Amino acid sequence: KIEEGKLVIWINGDKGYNGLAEVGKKFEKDTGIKVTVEHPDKLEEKFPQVAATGDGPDIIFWAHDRFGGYAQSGLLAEITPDKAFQDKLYPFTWDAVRYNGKLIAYPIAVEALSLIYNKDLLPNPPKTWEEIPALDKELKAKGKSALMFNLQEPYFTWPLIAADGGYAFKYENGKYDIKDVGVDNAGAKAGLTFLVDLIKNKHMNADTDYSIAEAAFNKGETAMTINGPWAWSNIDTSKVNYGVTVLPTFKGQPSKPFVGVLSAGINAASPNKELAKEFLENYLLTDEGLEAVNKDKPLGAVALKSYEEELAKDPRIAATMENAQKGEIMPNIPQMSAFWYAVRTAVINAASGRQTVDEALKDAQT
């Protein structure tokens, strides 16, 4: 079972886990309590299983959309910081981690995807998606591609699908209607159709994943990519002269990425709940704590007001916020996992030609 007297933390391998480990080391030096940070694969899927038996990490980090499902299963401890502490973070970030009237995690950062481009290959990035095919043709004649991003995770294609009207669950009367989905409406069909056509016209490969896309952009093989703040560190190391800006528009409409609030939840079966709260409230959610993680891998716009003010000057953060505002905060309801799996299958099947765009989305709707 979970050992008492130590803290085990899980966070995605793409995030600044080494920076988080430094915060853990400071905690141990001050309290004598050991902190172990790990970054398992598919941790958001592994947590429910291990936490079910009553095991798993003391703290789990992930975008808030997965937390509602965890709470419904009773896998998360309710957190109750005093109102004063709550005032140190933006009000909307707390709403993102509120389920059935109870807070179920500590918000850490607001993540939104942006268009990242190579200034040496494209000084002026396209304002619309409709311009990409012509731009790719031109660049292809030069041995390069216009755009490459992860097509295996729906998170990355969603901004285009939602651009012309696609949506997950209809929100009415103050609640999400699970039975009213917008993944197969006119707008969603138009968006995925455009993406599939880009593939059919050899402007993108249906097998492109995170690693492939990252390598391509960092090696200067593609003029643009779509990714989040965490990716900036690797790009800085590649020394590519890049810019981060607003995603291209589709049919005159801005792209609408699903906005995630990176959050830290506490395992309901943990015998170290108060220790976890002290680590999160007194060490991580401080300017110095977030800086340590951010220095490792950019968190993007943080939930902590005091630190966000310091990151506001960064043009890359301004672009992140601009895209976030054009998109929408993800719901945290339990049905989100079904939604994500459904869209993932639809995109992969349509992109690979296993199904027509219309039928792939019709099935995602169901």
Partner: peptide, 6 residues
């Protein structure tokens, strides 16, 4: 699929 299982 998005609207399935309760």
């Amino acid at each position: 699929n998005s609207s399935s299982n309760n």
